[PDB]
Amino acid sequence: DELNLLVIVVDANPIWWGKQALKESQFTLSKCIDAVMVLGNSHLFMNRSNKLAVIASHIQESRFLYDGKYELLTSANEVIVEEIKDLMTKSDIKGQHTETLLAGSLAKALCYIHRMNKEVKDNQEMKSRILVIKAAEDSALQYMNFMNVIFAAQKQNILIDACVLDSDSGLLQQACDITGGLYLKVPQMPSLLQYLLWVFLPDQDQRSQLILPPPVHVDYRAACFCHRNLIEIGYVCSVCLSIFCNFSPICTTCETAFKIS
Amino acid sequence: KVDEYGAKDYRLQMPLKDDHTSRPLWVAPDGHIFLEAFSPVYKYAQDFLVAIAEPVCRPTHVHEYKLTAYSLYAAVSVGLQTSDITEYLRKLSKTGVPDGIMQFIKLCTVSYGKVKLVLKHNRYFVESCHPDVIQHLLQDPVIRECRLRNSEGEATETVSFEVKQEMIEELQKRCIHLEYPLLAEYDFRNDSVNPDINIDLKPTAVLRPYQEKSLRKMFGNGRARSGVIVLPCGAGKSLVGVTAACTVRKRCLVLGNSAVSVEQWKAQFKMWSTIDDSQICRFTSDAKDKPIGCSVAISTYSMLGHTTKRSWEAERVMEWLKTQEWGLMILDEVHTIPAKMFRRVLTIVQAHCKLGLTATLVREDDKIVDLNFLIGPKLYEANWMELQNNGYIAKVQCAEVWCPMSPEFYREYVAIKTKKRILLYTMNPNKFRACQFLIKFHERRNDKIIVFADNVFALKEYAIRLNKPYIYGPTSQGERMQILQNFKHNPKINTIFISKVGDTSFDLPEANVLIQISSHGGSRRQEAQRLGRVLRAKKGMVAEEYNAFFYSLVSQDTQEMAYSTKRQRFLVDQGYSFKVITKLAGMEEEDLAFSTKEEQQQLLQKVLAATDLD
Amino acid sequence: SPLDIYPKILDFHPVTMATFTMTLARVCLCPMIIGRGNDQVAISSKFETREDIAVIRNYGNLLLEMSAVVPDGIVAFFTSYQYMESTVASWYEQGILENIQRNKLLFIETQDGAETSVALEKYQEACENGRGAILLSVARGKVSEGIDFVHHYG
Amino acid sequence: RWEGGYERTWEILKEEHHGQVRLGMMRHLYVVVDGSRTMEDQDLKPNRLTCTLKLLEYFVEEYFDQNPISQIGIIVTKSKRAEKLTELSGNPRKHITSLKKAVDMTCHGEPSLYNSLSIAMQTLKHMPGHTSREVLIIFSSLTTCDPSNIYDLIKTLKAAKIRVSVIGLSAEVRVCTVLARETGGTYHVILDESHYKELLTHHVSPPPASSSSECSLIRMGFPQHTIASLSDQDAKPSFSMAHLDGNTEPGLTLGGYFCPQCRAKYCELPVECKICGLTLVSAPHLARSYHHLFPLDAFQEIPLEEYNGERFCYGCQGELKDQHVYVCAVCQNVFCVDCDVFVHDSLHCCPGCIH
Ligand SMILES: [Zn+2]
Ligand SMILES: [Zn+2]
Ligand SMILES: [Zn+2]
Ligand SMILES: [Zn+2]
């Protein structure tokens, strides 16, 4: 009855992969896509009850991806190969927006998980996990929506694993900490697939008996809005929850004067 | 036709129609009918089958009823014709109705309602609108002897004729042989000979839906009709009798097994009927009242059946009864009637309407077919499980507890082949320990414990060893009543040993735990009746499915096993289940009697001292 | 209720005789008739049946259930003072009245208006103080004449 | 006289957000639970006590999930007395344990609302004005015993600006109605277990702040999870201050959370520091209530036949076969019923709006 859904989110920023191609490094985006497809094939391979949901997170929007080879696996891969080429051929950069729409893809994934869970037979239980791979820089404005996604996932108890390639993002660290997911940076991108298999592929119950790398320490410092500087103790607004390092009689954000005698 | 598997191949004679789910009835050509209780049309089919068919098995799901000529005559007396019944069967039978079944109904229905017997001026007249059948009946020599003739030997002449009272019962058997059953129709409202009685129903009396339904079945077309009604013990049977007597309002006679039942009936009439106490008299050997002005009389079979010389006052009472014309008579525990002495009472008493009320009808002597003409067809019999669900009766929790025989007892059990063998298995020390443990458990549970033991010696031994009250043969009435009233109220007394007298000789105070140790030998009706009488609905445990507790201690590998199985046949037919329990948890922790071997050896000595003479 | 009896009683002809039906967006009234007791005893108030102890006990059980269920405001109108006093005495002897008092406080009027007024004031104060108060009056007493009930009183 | 005739032959025949208004950012909630004889009633299966306490555990879970900066106190009024079942704190585990222990209690006596309200007022007397004072009362029985006038206590609560909301079980009580209306709280009545859950969920959400609500600049600290390694010479195991409060021997933990103001060591967060009174919080805890600041408005409902557009949901790519389609106000996307429900109830954000 173990219905395990493995959600895959891909950092499809064209800028980072274009630069990497300019670097002519050992690892390319095609290798990342192949590794993702292999991981999904193995996930469906482990058990029939296991299901796969793959969504591509591109700057323009989020795309739902899904001869000696398994027929259903062959069809799924050719579908995915069709989807990625379809996106890339139509991938036109029109605008100065560079940050990946990380939050929106997560919201779409959560909605799909909810839809499938409603469709789950009541005789069976659906464990769901989301795997996200990080390549380009993190997004700044999506912080509120990212926190909302984290809160919703923790409410529905969905593990979220973040995989770092080049750029570390403390947001992903905190997300994995709160959600209980696994966070790790892979230095050898070509070896990356094994890190997915050795760590991300096993289920959390399986990971319990298995010996795992220790979790990375995560900080939760706060930046005071008037200068965005990290502090230890700060003054919090009782109205709009704004943080101020210096005592103020009037709040800047909610425009409320502090009634202190 | 019979298949090789023993099933009778009825496929050829039962043409199935596609209305499967809608039609819930199966009509086998053997006369048996099957109904599915889970069908949405169960209630209507149940009510229809009650009037037309005699129940056989009423388990949870699939009920089996039977068709008899008596059932058909009862349905006709209700007022249902052949065409409507056949149409309803067809609308409910899953397959085609067999023609032989149809022919059987056709044969029975036509002959019904032909011969009528009327009692007027202490004279019994047989009348019919068809003198051809009447003239045909004159041919029978038995009828010729039964038909009243002049003192000169000459037979007397809408044409009817008087009939000898003492020859009525033999004529009744002849009517079945003549295939013309008597019609017991009473002028409920048209009576003028017998004056009414100022007796009514007090407002405290409430008729439950099944009670009112049974009464309405009895009173066909507003006219009282003699018959037999089966009511479970504790379902207000006495209330139903009082209600029927108040309804008829004519001269009412009731017969009970013992004077205790007489007192119960008198209290019931005082509790519900509006008749004056002065008009109520008991024809008992101890409490005597003049028959004059006795609007309603309560008596016993032995008093009326006392063939030996009675008291001179009893002679006057009998003369008054014979002179008195009884519009209504009430009989209790109808299963006792088939006895010759009690049957003679029916001839003795001249009564128009005779209604019998009882809890069971399975006589081990199968003397019930003739009983159909002694009184009439069975009018009604409620579903016990249905009353359990409705909460009218306590839902009994039934257990069969297997007690292994002691090998020394078992060796002696094999040794004896005679009637003395009863004491061997009825005095099992392991059974004694199990009984002691159960008594401790229920006393800690604070329940009323009734120990039923047919053997007098076994009952006295158990009661003395356990230091509990015992009831046996003589049982002086004052001491009996004292012990009963102590049991009802005194919390110190909650364990009463009652011998065979507890069945019908007196009323049993309501209890919850009934432990049966000794058996009559297969009295499937007597012990079931006593069980139903013991256990009644109890407030507080209404929600729970097990508010009444019954346990039967059976000696393993003995002839008691076969007796228990034969006995529970009727209760299983009533849908009651019995769970077999061998191991009693908690006995090892508790210390009980005969813990050591020689104690059981001493008990064996005591029992063997009681040889075949005892 | 009868629109024609009054012209006969007062010996005159009103020009207009119209009854204004009440339209409710919310059904604020639940008139119910209970003539069957717990034991299915026929409930009646005829003087022949007023002395029945069974009806007294049925009324006591109904009152106890109402106090245990219905909110604080309870008023019960009997048919006569003597019958009400006899029923109250019977309930006190039966012991049911103690449970009723435990559920909600009990107040019974008497002949004198002055003490009756104090009893009514105590009843209203108890209702306003959150403790269930039960009033027992007669249909022809002063309560039915000039005493009005607030929503939490009626 | 019904015995004349009876036949059943014919029966055998063929056949809710408010506006952009200030709310209760800081909450001091006290829950009042009745313990009278009426709690044994089976209005909610199996009885009032068990269902009420299970719903209370669920309510505490949701309340701490949505209000990290709130506090919970549990009071049981039994036998005309008031007993503080649980101390005022933010720990969900202790509250759940206390409720589980109270599941097997004995319900007897009568409620004493006066004493319970007096205890709550005394407890919340010293709380700061900016923090909201909220009281929830579960009233099973319709009657209570009060040693003194309750209207004086009502005046005291009004002067102390304490909000009290009551959810009765049988019917409405006039005194409780007046109390809730004057204190600014809301009075409700249980219809069934589902309605009980609905009312509890509604009361989870912060209440709107009245005009009298203060606006003060409160100072809070945000320590990290200082973990010491035994290989380092600077590893100082120390017992937790919260763990010292208990009877069991505190666990000597190598590291943890240390107060930036007085170096007080705590293993549980977010908990205000006991020594200096500083409230030690974390950034997600503050952000956990941000959705209340920007509620998600209801989307426009247009049936599929009336919508001439995409037949795939924007949220789950599911083919739109439902009778109703929910279109956003901002980005005007297409969402099915399930996605619309989940977004409004939990996500509180529109995917296209993020885009
Ligand atoms: Zn502010
Ligand atoms: Zn500190
Ligand atoms: Zn959707
Ligand atoms: Zn939108």
UniProtKB/Swiss-Prot annotation, chain A:
<dbReference type="GO" id="GO:0016251">
    <property type="term" value="F:RNA polymerase II general transcription initiation factor activity"/>
</dbReference>
<comment type="function">
    <text>Component of the general transcription and DNA repair factor IIH (TFIIH) core complex, which is involved in general and transcription-coupled nucleotide excision repair (NER) of damaged DNA and, when complexed to CAK, in RNA transcription by RNA polymerase II. In NER, TFIIH acts by opening DNA around the lesion to allow the excision of the damaged oligonucleotide and its replacement by a new DNA fragment. In transcription, TFIIH has an essential role in transcription initiation.</text>
</comment>
<dbReference type="GO" id="GO:0006289">
    <property type="term" value="P:nucleotide-excision repair"/>
</dbReference>
<dbReference type="Pfam" id="PF03850">
    <property type="entry name" value="Tfb4"/>
</dbReference>
<keyword id="KW-0227">DNA damage</keyword>
<dbReference type="GO" id="GO:0000438">
    <property type="term" value="C:core TFIIH complex portion of holo TFIIH complex"/>
</dbReference>
<dbReference type="GO" id="GO:0006366">
    <property type="term" value="P:transcription by RNA polymerase II"/>
</dbReference>
<keyword id="KW-0805">Transcription regulation</keyword>
<keyword id="KW-0863">Zinc-finger</keyword>
<dbReference type="GO" id="GO:0005675">
    <property type="term" value="C:transcription factor TFIIH holo complex"/>
</dbReference>
<dbReference type="InterPro" id="IPR004600">
    <property type="entry name" value="TFIIH_Tfb4/GTF2H3"/>
</dbReference>
<dbReference type="GO" id="GO:0006281">
    <property type="term" value="P:DNA repair"/>
</dbReference>
Swiss-Prot record, chain B:
<comment type="similarity">
    <text>Belongs to the helicase family. RAD25/XPB subfamily.</text>
</comment>
<dbReference type="GO" id="GO:0005524">
    <property type="term" value="F:ATP binding"/>
</dbReference>
<protein>
    <recommendedName>
        <fullName>General transcription and DNA repair factor IIH helicase/translocase subunit XPB</fullName>
        <ecNumber>5.6.2.4</ecNumber>
    </recommendedName>
</protein>
<comment type="function">
    <text>ATP-dependent 3'-5' DNA helicase/translocase. Binds dsDNA rather than ssDNA, unzipping it in a translocase rather than classical helicase activity. Component of the general transcription and DNA repair factor IIH (TFIIH) core complex. When complexed to CDK-activating kinase (CAK), involved in RNA transcription by RNA polymerase II. The ATPase activity of XPB/ERCC3, but not its helicase activity, is required for DNA opening; it may wrap around the damaged DNA wedging it open, causing localized melting that allows XPD/ERCC2 helicase to anchor.</text>
</comment>
<dbReference type="GO" id="GO:1901990">
    <property type="term" value="P:regulation of mitotic cell cycle phase transition"/>
</dbReference>
<keyword id="KW-0067">ATP-binding</keyword>
<keyword id="KW-0234">DNA repair</keyword>
<dbReference type="InterPro" id="IPR014001">
    <property type="entry name" value="Helicase_ATP-bd"/>
</dbReference>
<dbReference type="GO" id="GO:0097550">
    <property type="term" value="C:transcription preinitiation complex"/>
</dbReference>
<dbReference type="GO" id="GO:0006289">
    <property type="term" value="P:nucleotide-excision repair"/>
</dbReference>
<feature type="binding site">
    <location>
        <position position="533"/>
    </location>
    <ligand>
        <name>ATP</name>
    </ligand>
</feature>
<keyword id="KW-0597">Phosphoprotein</keyword>
UniProtKB/Swiss-Prot annotation, chain C:
<feature type="region of interest" description="Mediates interaction with MMS19">
    <location>
        <begin position="1"/>
        <end position="154"/>
    </location>
</feature>
<comment type="function">
    <text>ATP-dependent 5'-3' DNA helicase. Component of the general transcription and DNA repair factor IIH (TFIIH) core complex, not absolutely essential for minimal transcription in vitro. Required for transcription-coupled nucleotide excision repair (NER) of damaged DNA; recognizes damaged bases. Sequestered in chromatin on UV-damaged DNA. When complexed to CDK-activating kinase (CAK), involved in transcription by RNA polymerase II. In NER, TFIIH acts by opening DNA around the lesion to allow the excision of the damaged oligonucleotide and its replacement by a new DNA fragment.</text>
</comment>
<comment type="similarity">
    <text>Belongs to the helicase family. RAD3/XPD subfamily.</text>
</comment>
<comment type="subunit">
    <text>Component of the 7-subunit TFIIH core complex composed of XPB/ERCC3, XPD/ERCC2, GTF2H1, GTF2H2, GTF2H3, GTF2H4 and GTF2H5, which is active in NER. The core complex associates with the 3-subunit CDK-activating kinase (CAK) module composed of CCNH/cyclin H, CDK7 and MNAT1 to form the 10-subunit holoenzyme (holo-TFIIH) active in transcription. Interacts with GTF2H2 (p44) which stimulates the 5'-3' helicase activity of this subunit. Component of the MMXD complex, which includes CIAO1, ERCC2, CIAO2B, MMS19 and SLC25A5. Interacts with CIAO1 and CIAO2B; the interaction WITH CIAO2B is direct.</text>
</comment>
<protein>
    <recommendedName>
        <fullName>General transcription and DNA repair factor IIH helicase subunit XPD</fullName>
    </recommendedName>
</protein>
<comment type="subunit">
    <text>(Microbial infection) Interacts with Epstein-Barr virus EBNA2.</text>
</comment>
UniProtKB/Swiss-Prot annotation, chain D:
<dbReference type="InterPro" id="IPR013087">
    <property type="entry name" value="Znf_C2H2_type"/>
</dbReference>
<dbReference type="GO" id="GO:0002031">
    <property type="term" value="P:G protein-coupled receptor internalization"/>
</dbReference>
<keyword id="KW-0597">Phosphoprotein</keyword>
<keyword id="KW-0945">Host-virus interaction</keyword>
<keyword id="KW-0805">Transcription regulation</keyword>
<dbReference type="InterPro" id="IPR046349">
    <property type="entry name" value="C1-like_sf"/>
</dbReference>
<keyword id="KW-0863">Zinc-finger</keyword>
<dbReference type="GO" id="GO:0009411">
    <property type="term" value="P:response to UV"/>
</dbReference>
<comment type="function">
    <text>Component of the general transcription and DNA repair factor IIH (TFIIH) core complex, which is involved in general and transcription-coupled nucleotide excision repair (NER) of damaged DNA and, when complexed to CAK, in RNA transcription by RNA polymerase II. In NER, TFIIH acts by opening DNA around the lesion to allow the excision of the damaged oligonucleotide and its replacement by a new DNA fragment. In transcription, TFIIH has an essential role in transcription initiation.</text>
</comment>
<keyword id="KW-0862">Zinc</keyword>
<comment type="subunit">
    <text>(Microbial infection) Interacts with varicella-zoster virus IE63 protein.</text>
</comment>
<dbReference type="InterPro" id="IPR002035">
    <property type="entry name" value="VWF_A"/>
</dbReference>
